[PDB]
Each structure stands twice: as structure tokens, then as C-alpha cells.
Amino acid sequence: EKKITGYTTVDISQWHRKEHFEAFQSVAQCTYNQTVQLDITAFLKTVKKNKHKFYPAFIHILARLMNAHPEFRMAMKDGELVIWDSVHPCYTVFHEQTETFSSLWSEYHDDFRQFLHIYSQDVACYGENLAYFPKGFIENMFFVSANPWVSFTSFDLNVANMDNFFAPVFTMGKYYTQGDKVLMPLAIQVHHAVCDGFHVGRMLNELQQYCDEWQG
Amino acid sequence: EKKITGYTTVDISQWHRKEHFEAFQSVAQCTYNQTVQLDITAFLKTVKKNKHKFYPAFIHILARLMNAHPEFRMAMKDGELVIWDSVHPCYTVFHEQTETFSSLWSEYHDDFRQFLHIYSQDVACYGENLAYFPKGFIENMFFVSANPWVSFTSFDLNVANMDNFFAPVFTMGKYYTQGDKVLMPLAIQVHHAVCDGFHVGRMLNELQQYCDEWQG
Amino acid sequence: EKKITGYTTVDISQWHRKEHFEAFQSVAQCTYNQTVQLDITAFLKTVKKNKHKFYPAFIHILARLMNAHPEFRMAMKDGELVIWDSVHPCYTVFHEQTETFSSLWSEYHDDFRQFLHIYSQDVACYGENLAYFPKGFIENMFFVSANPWVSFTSFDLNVANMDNFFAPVFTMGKYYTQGDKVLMPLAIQVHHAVCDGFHVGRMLNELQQYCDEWQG
């Protein structure tokens, strides 16, 4: 083994969002959640036409977006701002017997068949390990918390200590029938310093785009 | 004369969540609010069939569900995690004339006919008292906030401080008519140190049944 | 040359919310977000029957409401609670070319035709200024955020440090068709020391009212 990942030191002075970040780092600091009833009618039907189940598929669709726009791949290094070359999904796995949950991460690959292979190998392996973090944390990761129990009309996350916490969090809900369409609640949490409403806003339209494309 | 109530000094060692809690009490502490659009088509009918004001009937279903699951009835006592043997509801009552509000609790009984009687006797007495807390704090209590004004799609409660804030908060909304169906918005505020999305999920799942079941 | 706009200073002893404020400024201090699925059917058609841009007309209504109820026009001055005679709308404007946003404020007027003149000029003058605040801070203002990217079911704003931060914050979304009605997602965040659920409640019910009366 041996690694090293996407350092991309951004100098904040040549940045077109220099004071925006500056202000939301200090006095105006805040995170924010928005939630959408997401059309998944075509996604689900094409995910059921294949023998895969709706999770790694969706994980992948998000991971793709997170690995398109650098505004989601930002964190704090040695007192400096960086952009990871890649970000990997840290999803929740539930334990029926003990009623607890573990969060674990797979390695992201653009090719869906490659990624699902990594995912399946990881979940078929650690899916029954009771360690809170069975594979531990990793520098370059974003989060997806499954919430399959509830068809929520809002999921707000409310962090105590948000300092430099830029890594975005997705919470996803219990899908439901409504008209012809099958809708499914999805929520994001992002630190305002690294995401203007515009950024979050377009990614939720490309998420709507990619769910109507294919499995991955 | 005296009272003395509640306690089950939980050892962190044996607990199936020792690290979930530990990490959610420092490093990555937070709370989370989720909201749902609740079917009360069956509840409302049964409640309107009998001489019962809506409010106290709901406060009771919320009561039952708190006193079923150890996870809600948790608080930090003398520097330790305990689970109170029971938890009593603390509901808001509005003052017309002054346009302020008061929260007042009623001792919880599993038998509904008992509780509504203590609730009546409580509000008949204090409902026109202008004290913010006409009866005061009670170690072992959860919250219900009346919000009959807005048919809300979201309601986040954003605590400025959450250290050992474990007692949950409910907020119920202006119900309304839909497709032969009647829906009403509810929200929970919980601390992720004592409440995984699972617990909170099933408690909203039982809330459906208990509402599609009798008054109490 | 010189300004000086007046407060209406509040003494905490005579005020009917003397401990609602004191408590919600200390131990129980918090902010809260609620979102509504606002009906703008009437407000839209009447906007489109005139040659008026939607944004400024809405901004107007919001201010009309803000400047109708003192509870939204409260801030800290010199360790003292005050009430601004009037409060002005601080709205955002987006820049396509640089993918950032700037916030600027127009001076409020009851007369819609007057306000639109002042708005239109402010936007025609500063709309292409790449400065985060081309006009800047003014004590007596409330906030609006354009989020026309997403028909959100929930917008929650999770400010880091809420100390005395009383200025209310609106966020409006991508309006959408839904059977003979056109709904527009809207959210308010307010500080509970100056806004009870009832205060925010009626303001949204009058908001619905004005959106069914005229443009302004």
C-alpha cells in the first residue's frame, strides 16, 4: 500500500469569491440545509430493470456530482484551503440485530461497474462489522446518510462546531408514490463559505438530470 | 409530601453505542430536525367523534411514544447519562389578549382518560396565568410546541447551545385538507448523541399507527 | 448630508415579554426556520398583467409586512433593545459571468411605484458591481435571498453565532405548477428572543393575504 491525494492550494486573493469566503469564515459563518422531493420515477424503473438495488446506484450519482464541482471537494489542510482531486462517499450501513449503524466509505470510480464492485466488496465484507467506523475516516470524503424509515418533508442537520467543516452531507429518505411520479426526499448540508445557494442549486438540477439518464 | 423519580445509570462500557455517543458528544456533536406531513384522517375523525379537544389527544400520543423508548427519556444528571423511568409532556398554551405564550407540563399517565383529566385540571387552572412557566421546570420532561398558524413544510429548531440537551422537542402545525385525506405537519428536534435516525424513524412510524388507532 | 434614523427603545421591565426575551437571550437562546409552500397564483397573474419583475414586487410585500409589525424591526444598539421606525429590504442579486452573488439594499417605501423606482435604479446602477456589498451595511434592514434554482421543500439557515442577531431572513424559491395553482417555496429564519411562533405565523398569513390583494 501507499497513497497521497489531491492537494490544490487555492490562493484566496486571486479567487473571485475572496471576501465571500472570508466573511463566512468569520462573522457571518453558518451552514444550511435544503430538502427536495426528488423525482426518481425513471431512475428507479431503470434501476429495477437491472438487478441492482437503489442505493449504491444513487450513491454513485451523487459521488459523480461531488467529483465534478470543486466547491464540494474543499477542506482545511495545514492552516490552508485545498481542493481534493477526488472525494469518496462515506455512506451509512444499518445493523438490524443490534439497532446501531456503521459509516463506511468506498473508493469512487467514474465507471459504475467499477465502483459498485468496490462498494459490494466493502459491504459484503464489513457490513457486519460493529465498529462505528470499520474502515476509519479518510481525508477526502463526503457523506451520505440513508434515512429509509421516513418520507421526510425536511431534514435539517445542526452541527455544534462547524469551524472548517466544509465536507457536504446528504441525507436521503423513504421514497413514495404520488401521481404517476415516484418522489424521494433528499437533503444537503453545506458550509456557506464554500457553497453559495447557486452551487447547491445547480447540483440539485444535475442530480435531477442524471437520475433521468441511466444507472450510471 | 415528597417525590423522587427516575434513573437508570447507564454504563457506557456495556452499551451498544458507547462510541456513537462519545464522538457525538465532542468531535462531531450536532442535533437534527426532521419534519413530516402526517396522516391524521383517521385520528381527526375519531377525535371529532368524541368530546375531545384535538391538542391534548396528540400530546398523549407523543407522550406514549416517549415513554416507550429509552432513547428519548435520556438526560445528563450528575455528570452521568440516565434514563428517567417516565417523561411528562411540556406543551405550549397561547394567550390571546397579551399575544405571548406559556409552557406548562402535566403529569403523564398511560391511561388517556386519566391524563386528559390532569391536563384539563392543569389548563383550567393555569391557562390564563401569564407566567412563562406557571408550574416550572421538571427534570423528566419533553416538549410539544403548538403552531396552529402555519401549514409548514419545514420547521427547524436551531439551538445556540446543545450540550446535554437530550429532551426532544415536537412542533405540530396547521393541519389541512388534501386528496380525501387530512394531513398535519409535525417536527422533532433531537440530539444525535442519544438519537440515531433509526429511533426517530420508528417513533414517527408508530405515530402513524397510534393515530390510525383510537384516541388513547 | 446627515441622517440619524430613530429607535423606539424598549425597556425590558414594562414589556409583556420580559422573561421570554431574557430567557431566550440566555439559557434557552435559539433561532428557528420554517418553510411554507406559499400560494402565489394571484400574485403572479397580477404581476404578469403589469410589466413588473417578480422579485422587487415580492421584496416589497415582505417589507410591507416587516414595517407593519415591530417584532421584526428589532436589534441591539448599545446593549439596549431598540425598534427601528422603518426597516429596509436587503436583497441579493446574482452575477452570471463570475458565478457569485452580491447583496444590496433599496430604501423602503409604502408606495410600490416609489419603491420600484428606487429598486430599479439601485439594481441598474450596481447590478454589475462585483462587490459583495456595493452599498453595504445599514443598521435597520431585513434580508431576502433569491434561490430560484430549487423548488425546496425545506430551507434551513444554520447561523454559527446568533448573539443579538434579530434581523429576519427570508429565502424564496423556484415557483412551480401544481394543478390550477402556482406555489412558491418560502422560508423565514428568526431569533426566538424577538419572534414567537405566533408572530412569524400571522406574518405569513398576511403574506398570503397581500399576495391575493394587489401588487402593493
XYZ file of C-alpha atoms in Angstrom:
648
model
C 0.000 0.000 0.000
C 0.820 3.746 -0.248
C -1.138 6.868 -1.144
C -1.220 10.690 -1.433
C -4.159 12.737 -2.750
C -5.465 15.969 -4.285
C -3.779 18.952 -2.745
C -4.807 22.007 -4.779
C -3.854 25.040 -2.714
C -6.132 27.888 -3.775
C -4.772 31.347 -3.128
C -7.773 33.262 -1.839
C -6.611 36.633 -3.242
C -6.875 35.644 -6.940
C -10.208 33.939 -6.187
C -13.449 35.517 -7.496
C -15.058 34.688 -4.112
C -12.305 36.031 -1.811
C -14.339 38.102 0.694
C -17.362 35.791 0.377
C -15.258 33.013 1.920
C -13.575 35.482 4.280
C -16.889 36.751 5.696
C -18.424 33.249 6.067
C -15.231 32.098 7.781
C -15.517 34.784 10.453
C -18.513 36.929 11.447
C -21.214 35.598 9.069
C -20.312 31.879 9.491
C -23.178 29.383 9.019
C -24.195 26.110 7.372
C -27.540 25.460 5.669
C -29.878 22.629 4.689
C -32.318 22.412 1.852
C -34.545 19.485 1.003
C -36.294 18.440 -2.200
C -38.876 15.878 -3.161
C -36.814 14.369 -5.943
C -38.336 12.749 -8.993
C -36.805 9.262 -9.129
C -39.517 7.644 -11.285
C -37.202 6.978 -14.230
C -34.184 6.283 -12.043
C -35.981 3.601 -10.042
C -37.587 1.913 -13.071
C -34.190 1.669 -14.814
C -32.606 0.540 -11.539
C -35.265 -2.179 -11.247
C -34.874 -3.150 -14.921
C -31.341 -4.052 -13.849
C -30.819 -6.380 -10.865
C -29.042 -3.720 -8.741
C -30.761 -2.110 -5.760
C -31.360 1.600 -5.270
C -28.525 2.761 -3.039
C -25.057 2.209 -4.499
C -26.618 3.401 -7.747
C -27.754 6.626 -6.064
C -24.534 6.878 -4.039
C -22.759 6.810 -7.397
C -24.928 9.566 -8.932
C -24.084 11.879 -6.020
C -20.392 10.876 -5.992
C -20.238 11.863 -9.690
C -21.565 15.340 -8.913
C -19.246 15.720 -5.920
C -16.422 14.809 -8.284
C -17.451 17.379 -10.885
C -17.643 20.619 -8.943
C -14.632 21.675 -6.798
C -16.929 23.644 -4.428
C -17.907 20.324 -2.815
C -14.335 19.000 -2.622
C -12.949 21.632 -0.231
C -11.343 21.225 3.207
C -8.658 22.645 5.511
C -5.051 21.414 5.357
C -2.170 22.963 7.297
C -3.999 26.222 8.013
C -4.752 26.446 4.298
C -7.615 25.872 1.851
C -7.378 22.905 -0.539
C -9.411 21.176 -3.279
C -9.183 17.354 -3.295
C -8.544 15.820 -6.735
C -11.240 13.353 -5.725
C -13.758 12.886 -2.920
C -15.066 9.465 -1.808
C -18.529 8.552 -0.486
C -18.966 7.770 3.212
C -22.329 6.045 3.478
C -24.187 4.564 6.424
C -24.824 0.834 6.837
C -27.539 -0.299 9.274
C -27.463 -3.243 11.723
C -30.844 -4.981 12.254
C -29.903 -7.128 15.256
C -28.199 -4.507 17.400
C -30.186 -1.470 16.107
C -26.958 0.502 15.640
C -25.313 1.861 12.488
C -21.817 1.991 10.994
C -20.493 4.516 8.486
C -18.020 3.238 5.915
C -16.503 4.550 2.691
C -15.732 3.034 -0.694
C -13.338 4.321 -3.342
C -15.024 6.356 -6.074
C -14.644 5.399 -9.721
C -16.402 7.067 -12.646
C -17.234 3.686 -14.188
C -20.336 2.496 -12.335
C -19.466 -1.208 -12.718
C -16.034 -0.472 -11.193
C -17.469 1.488 -8.262
C -20.275 -0.960 -7.427
C -17.616 -3.693 -7.387
C -15.625 -1.681 -4.784
C -18.848 -0.938 -2.874
C -20.156 -4.535 -2.916
C -16.756 -5.917 -1.877
C -16.666 -3.436 1.030
C -20.277 -4.008 2.150
C -20.139 -7.805 1.693
C -17.043 -7.643 3.909
C -17.545 -5.050 6.684
C -21.370 -4.827 6.519
C -21.427 -6.981 9.647
C -18.542 -5.287 11.496
C -19.956 -3.441 14.519
C -17.193 -0.831 14.556
C -18.683 2.663 14.356
C -16.100 3.333 11.608
C -14.977 -0.110 10.368
C -12.604 1.342 7.751
C -11.916 4.519 9.748
C -12.000 8.096 8.452
C -10.236 9.373 5.302
C -9.065 12.891 4.319
C -11.000 13.269 1.052
C -14.596 12.208 1.816
C -18.237 13.354 1.612
C -21.217 11.847 3.441
C -24.470 10.068 2.554
C -26.793 9.161 5.457
C -29.613 6.859 4.434
C -32.886 7.549 6.220
C -35.085 4.829 4.736
C -37.577 4.943 7.600
C -39.183 8.322 6.903
C -40.719 10.179 3.936
C -39.450 13.469 5.320
C -40.517 16.858 4.076
C -37.429 18.340 5.782
C -34.156 17.015 7.142
C -32.116 19.725 8.816
C -28.675 18.987 10.247
C -27.474 21.265 13.024
C -23.726 20.972 13.783
C -22.318 22.209 17.087
C -18.820 23.022 15.852
C -18.836 23.935 12.148
C -15.353 25.518 12.032
C -13.672 24.439 8.786
C -16.284 21.685 8.408
C -16.778 22.001 4.634
C -17.403 18.375 3.652
C -21.024 18.176 2.452
C -23.644 15.804 3.939
C -26.502 14.119 2.035
C -29.471 12.681 3.886
C -31.858 10.602 1.753
C -35.404 9.471 2.534
C -38.147 6.867 2.073
C -39.470 7.137 -1.482
C -43.215 7.215 -2.153
C -45.828 7.090 -4.894
C -47.500 10.362 -5.872
C -49.412 10.770 -9.125
C -47.529 8.922 -11.848
C -44.251 10.045 -10.320
C -42.326 8.373 -7.523
C -40.753 11.088 -5.383
C -37.878 10.720 -2.925
C -36.700 13.300 -0.332
C -33.037 14.365 -0.500
C -31.314 16.911 1.760
C -27.883 18.573 1.612
C -25.914 20.393 4.317
C -23.124 22.734 3.163
C -20.902 25.334 4.855
C -21.875 28.664 3.303
C -18.185 29.586 2.964
C -17.659 27.011 0.185
C -21.214 26.884 -1.281
C -23.411 29.777 -2.399
C -27.074 28.851 -2.954
C -26.240 28.806 -6.667
C -23.753 25.930 -6.254
C -26.099 23.695 -4.216
C -28.885 24.746 -6.585
C -27.340 23.586 -9.853
C -26.118 20.293 -8.394
C -29.734 19.505 -7.462
C -30.665 20.052 -11.122
C -27.855 17.869 -12.443
C -28.918 15.293 -9.846
C -32.402 15.528 -11.380
C -30.710 15.296 -14.803
C -28.600 12.230 -14.004
C -31.492 10.369 -12.360
C -33.309 10.573 -15.690
C -30.244 9.496 -17.676
C -29.147 5.954 -16.701
C -27.965 3.741 -13.805
C -24.519 5.428 -14.057
C -45.148 15.323 50.552
C -42.088 14.013 48.633
C -41.478 12.724 45.085
C -38.061 11.362 43.957
C -38.277 9.788 40.494
C -36.417 8.279 37.505
C -32.859 6.988 36.824
C -31.161 4.025 35.208
C -27.456 4.960 35.473
C -26.287 3.698 32.049
C -22.739 2.389 31.897
C -21.017 3.480 28.699
C -18.884 0.325 28.771
C -21.664 -2.238 28.196
C -23.781 -0.036 25.917
C -24.025 -0.938 22.218
C -23.448 2.743 21.357
C -20.531 3.721 23.631
C -18.572 5.379 20.807
C -21.510 6.748 18.792
C -22.358 8.722 21.927
C -18.732 9.549 22.784
C -17.930 11.002 19.340
C -21.351 12.715 19.135
C -20.688 14.404 22.487
C -17.452 16.115 21.415
C -15.678 15.996 17.990
C -18.808 15.706 15.835
C -21.716 16.805 18.085
C -24.970 18.013 16.498
C -28.765 17.982 16.587
C -31.162 17.336 13.755
C -34.707 18.317 12.941
C -36.941 16.452 10.582
C -40.475 17.280 9.555
C -43.298 15.118 8.165
C -46.682 15.551 6.575
C -48.751 13.343 8.854
C -51.934 11.492 8.005
C -54.433 12.275 10.722
C -57.527 11.469 8.576
C -58.363 8.612 10.988
C -57.246 10.353 14.114
C -59.171 13.545 13.474
C -62.405 11.648 12.751
C -62.208 9.627 15.989
C -61.280 12.763 18.000
C -64.145 14.771 16.408
C -66.466 11.840 17.173
C -65.844 12.346 20.900
C -65.841 15.367 23.255
C -62.070 15.846 22.976
C -60.110 18.921 22.004
C -57.531 17.921 19.403
C -54.385 19.159 21.188
C -54.361 17.035 24.415
C -55.084 13.861 22.407
C -51.932 14.374 20.303
C -49.805 15.416 23.291
C -50.813 11.979 24.617
C -49.664 10.005 21.572
C -46.383 11.896 21.731
C -46.295 11.051 25.460
C -46.861 7.293 24.887
C -44.041 7.221 22.332
C -41.568 8.978 24.630
C -42.411 6.570 27.444
C -41.902 3.548 25.204
C -38.362 4.181 24.037
C -35.460 4.686 26.481
C -33.662 6.822 23.852
C -35.903 9.879 24.307
C -36.145 9.828 28.120
C -32.350 10.367 28.415
C -30.661 13.326 30.081
C -27.417 14.198 31.790
C -27.905 14.240 35.543
C -24.971 14.471 37.949
C -22.364 14.207 35.175
C -23.776 10.895 34.019
C -26.204 9.543 31.459
C -29.526 8.430 32.920
C -32.859 7.295 31.545
C -35.843 8.649 33.501
C -38.454 5.983 34.346
C -41.012 8.244 32.653
C -41.215 11.610 30.850
C -44.026 14.169 31.171
C -45.216 16.414 28.298
C -44.484 20.152 28.342
C -46.931 21.882 25.995
C -47.398 25.478 24.902
C -50.661 27.261 25.575
C -51.340 30.587 23.839
C -52.567 33.802 25.483
C -54.959 35.737 23.202
C -55.106 39.093 24.947
C -51.373 39.604 25.537
C -50.100 37.781 22.415
C -47.494 35.883 24.446
C -47.292 32.185 25.300
C -46.710 29.891 28.265
C -45.397 26.350 28.501
C -46.926 24.127 31.196
C -46.400 20.417 31.853
C -48.904 17.786 33.019
C -48.024 14.606 34.913
C -48.151 11.703 32.467
C -50.421 8.666 32.877
C -50.518 5.740 30.452
C -54.329 5.727 30.739
C -55.588 8.522 28.466
C -58.852 9.256 30.371
C -56.622 9.908 33.405
C -54.206 12.208 31.579
C -56.793 14.417 29.808
C -58.333 14.894 33.253
C -54.963 16.060 34.701
C -54.451 18.127 31.536
C -57.884 19.788 31.917
C -57.373 20.403 35.659
C -53.963 21.890 34.739
C -55.100 24.223 31.951
C -58.401 25.124 33.660
C -56.154 26.401 36.423
C -53.103 27.908 34.684
C -54.332 28.522 31.104
C -54.922 32.187 31.992
C -51.818 32.592 34.159
C -49.283 34.894 32.468
C -46.157 33.231 33.852
C -43.868 31.835 31.132
C -43.677 28.759 33.374
C -46.741 28.767 35.689
C -45.656 25.396 37.187
C -41.935 25.396 36.351
C -39.156 23.024 35.281
C -39.405 19.267 35.882
C -36.222 17.199 35.368
C -38.023 14.459 33.384
C -39.911 16.213 30.562
C -40.144 16.542 26.749
C -41.703 19.302 24.639
C -44.625 19.971 22.332
C -44.860 23.374 20.625
C -48.207 24.480 19.236
C -48.008 26.136 15.828
C -51.608 26.171 14.508
C -50.903 29.243 12.346
C -48.706 27.857 9.575
C -49.202 24.699 7.490
C -45.436 24.243 7.323
C -43.326 22.081 5.043
C -40.303 22.531 7.298
C -39.609 23.545 10.897
C -36.002 23.571 12.107
C -35.191 24.322 15.724
C -31.735 25.816 15.893
C -30.348 25.727 19.471
C -27.474 28.118 20.148
C -26.361 25.531 22.661
C -26.952 21.772 22.796
C -24.550 20.437 25.435
C -26.548 17.596 27.018
C -29.798 18.923 25.546
C -31.403 15.478 25.142
C -35.103 16.071 25.867
C -36.628 16.159 22.438
C -38.890 18.865 21.039
C -42.067 18.339 18.967
C -43.676 21.065 16.870
C -47.108 20.459 15.379
C -48.661 22.562 12.641
C -51.784 23.853 10.959
C -53.412 20.744 9.534
C -55.223 20.850 6.169
C -57.239 19.032 3.550
C -55.866 17.159 0.520
C -56.929 14.125 -1.528
C -59.916 12.924 0.534
C -57.103 12.885 3.085
C -56.264 15.214 6.006
C -52.563 15.931 6.707
C -50.792 17.692 9.563
C -47.110 18.772 9.811
C -45.009 17.539 12.778
C -41.314 18.118 13.559
C -38.859 16.522 16.031
C -35.666 18.126 17.368
C -33.229 15.510 18.673
C -29.633 15.242 19.784
C -27.691 12.771 17.598
C -25.751 11.593 20.693
C -28.873 9.865 22.060
C -30.885 9.566 18.838
C -29.881 7.815 15.617
C -32.148 8.348 12.619
C -33.471 4.847 13.285
C -35.045 5.558 16.697
C -36.503 8.839 15.470
C -37.656 6.991 12.335
C -39.665 4.244 14.014
C -41.127 6.687 16.537
C -42.672 8.535 13.602
C -43.715 5.158 12.204
C -45.600 4.197 15.355
C -47.094 7.719 15.375
C -48.917 6.725 12.191
C -50.411 3.558 13.716
C -51.237 5.170 17.054
C -53.033 7.911 15.114
C -54.845 5.421 12.854
C -55.719 3.730 16.183
C -58.155 5.027 18.858
C -57.938 8.334 20.791
C -55.972 6.714 23.653
C -25.531 65.252 4.323
C -26.614 63.812 7.729
C -29.157 61.123 8.689
C -29.887 59.800 12.221
C -32.854 57.427 11.972
C -34.527 56.793 15.278
C -35.008 53.827 17.529
C -38.075 53.387 19.753
C -36.006 51.906 22.644
C -37.650 49.129 24.697
C -37.466 48.906 28.480
C -37.451 45.228 29.480
C -39.415 45.788 32.726
C -42.702 47.134 31.279
C -42.640 44.861 28.213
C -45.052 41.881 28.314
C -42.263 39.542 27.152
C -39.785 40.454 29.909
C -38.677 36.869 30.614
C -39.438 35.424 27.190
C -36.684 37.735 25.933
C -34.358 37.313 28.929
C -34.582 33.501 28.838
C -34.335 33.298 25.031
C -31.289 35.554 25.252
C -29.565 33.249 27.770
C -30.002 29.508 28.531
C -32.765 28.722 26.003
C -31.440 31.028 23.222
C -32.094 29.807 19.669
C -33.168 30.721 16.126
C -35.759 28.829 14.060
C -36.504 28.224 10.398
C -39.865 27.414 8.976
C -40.669 26.948 5.321
C -44.072 27.287 3.634
C -45.492 26.191 0.312
C -46.743 29.703 -0.478
C -49.592 30.189 -2.943
C -48.674 32.951 -5.372
C -51.281 32.225 -8.090
C -52.937 35.641 -7.692
C -49.680 37.497 -7.017
C -48.198 36.039 -10.226
C -51.027 36.779 -12.662
C -51.300 40.365 -11.404
C -47.522 40.744 -11.680
C -47.720 39.496 -15.289
C -50.733 41.699 -16.083
C -48.297 44.543 -15.451
C -44.770 44.912 -16.846
C -43.253 44.197 -13.431
C -40.371 41.962 -12.447
C -41.424 39.419 -9.811
C -38.511 39.792 -7.363
C -38.906 43.524 -6.485
C -42.698 43.263 -6.171
C -42.342 40.424 -3.669
C -39.467 42.107 -1.806
C -41.931 44.960 -1.421
C -44.665 42.844 0.204
C -42.133 41.335 2.620
C -41.033 44.821 3.704
C -44.703 45.947 3.883
C -45.121 43.182 6.454
C -41.800 43.881 8.187
C -42.777 47.525 8.512
C -46.231 46.576 9.853
C -45.048 44.635 12.921
C -42.411 45.889 15.385
C -41.253 42.375 16.352
C -39.299 42.040 13.084
C -37.747 45.511 13.352
C -35.688 44.810 16.490
C -31.904 44.900 17.016
C -29.201 45.759 19.553
C -27.846 49.319 19.645
C -25.708 49.936 22.732
C -26.545 46.958 24.941
C -30.146 48.108 24.568
C -33.169 46.666 22.751
C -34.495 49.102 20.132
C -37.145 49.277 17.374
C -36.277 50.893 14.028
C -39.086 53.199 12.832
C -38.621 51.576 9.448
C -36.588 48.655 8.136
C -35.251 48.381 4.582
C -35.027 45.294 2.321
C -31.566 43.833 1.748
C -31.846 41.538 -1.256
C -29.360 39.528 -3.304
C -28.544 39.870 -7.000
C -26.712 37.169 -8.976
C -23.856 37.604 -11.480
C -23.931 35.077 -14.359
C -20.456 35.759 -15.693
C -18.489 35.274 -12.460
C -20.932 32.853 -10.740
C -21.062 34.863 -7.498
C -23.708 36.962 -5.744
C -23.789 40.448 -4.238
C -26.254 41.850 -1.713
C -27.643 45.389 -1.882
C -30.421 47.351 -0.173
C -33.083 49.680 -1.527
C -34.750 52.285 0.687
C -38.268 51.099 1.514
C -41.481 52.967 0.722
C -45.127 52.025 1.301
C -45.896 53.267 -2.207
C -44.964 50.444 -4.588
C -44.322 52.764 -7.557
C -41.854 54.844 -5.479
C -40.029 51.768 -4.163
C -39.742 50.119 -7.585
C -38.176 53.339 -8.921
C -35.556 53.248 -6.115
C -35.019 49.491 -6.535
C -34.786 49.596 -10.359
C -32.207 52.381 -10.152
C -30.176 50.667 -7.423
C -30.095 47.463 -9.484
C -29.489 49.292 -12.781
C -26.639 51.140 -11.036
C -24.928 48.380 -9.027
C -26.157 45.100 -10.622
C -22.802 44.620 -12.359
C -20.646 45.660 -9.380
C -18.659 42.572 -8.357
C -18.509 43.758 -4.738
C -20.090 41.581 -2.023
C -21.783 44.797 -0.786
C -21.752 47.601 -3.370
C -23.848 49.722 -0.983
C -23.220 47.822 2.268
C -24.298 47.678 5.927
C -27.223 49.668 7.260
C -28.425 49.028 10.843
C -32.141 48.896 10.003
C -32.518 46.189 7.357
C -34.020 42.743 6.871
C -32.871 40.091 4.411
C -34.135 38.336 1.302
C -32.266 35.576 -0.569
C -33.042 34.550 -4.098
C -32.924 30.796 -4.533
C -34.720 30.446 -7.878
C -32.707 27.282 -8.585
C -34.659 24.831 -6.448
C -38.324 24.280 -5.523
C -37.256 23.478 -1.978
C -39.481 21.699 0.491
C -37.194 22.955 3.254
C -34.709 25.759 3.625
C -32.962 25.915 6.959
C -30.288 28.515 7.772
C -27.880 27.363 10.451
C -26.055 30.502 11.672
C -22.995 29.954 13.868
C -23.248 32.891 16.281
C -26.771 34.208 16.832
C -25.987 36.698 19.633
C -28.468 39.586 19.216
C -28.851 38.662 15.530
C -32.535 39.615 15.318
C -32.791 40.805 11.690
C -35.151 38.366 9.980
C -34.017 36.392 6.900
C -36.292 35.315 4.062
C -35.478 32.782 1.363
C -37.732 32.315 -1.656
C -37.527 29.508 -4.220
C -38.328 28.225 -7.706
C -42.120 28.555 -8.076
C -43.934 25.629 -9.701
C -47.212 24.480 -11.253
C -49.436 22.173 -9.210
C -52.977 21.919 -10.583
C -54.626 25.315 -11.197
C -52.383 26.744 -8.505
C -48.853 28.126 -8.627
C -46.871 27.654 -5.402
C -43.583 29.293 -4.407
C -41.446 27.838 -1.579
C -40.681 30.478 1.087
C -38.783 30.351 4.390
C -38.148 32.658 7.354
C -35.421 32.402 9.959
C -35.957 34.497 13.125
C -34.383 34.792 16.592
C -36.788 33.415 19.245
C -35.909 36.231 21.683
C -37.815 38.661 19.422
C -40.153 36.300 17.497
C -42.682 33.852 18.937
C -44.277 31.267 16.639
C -47.419 33.407 16.587
C -45.541 36.488 15.351
C -43.969 34.578 12.446
C -47.301 32.800 11.983
C -49.552 35.792 11.309
C -46.887 37.480 9.219
C -47.091 34.519 6.824
C -50.900 34.618 6.887
C -50.874 38.300 5.982
C -48.222 37.463 3.403
C -50.745 35.136 1.809
C -53.296 37.958 2.186
C -51.259 40.608 0.378
C -50.349 38.139 -2.384
C -54.093 37.976 -3.073
C -54.669 41.739 -2.888
C -52.726 43.977 -5.309
C -49.079 44.219 -6.456
C -48.524 46.569 -3.500
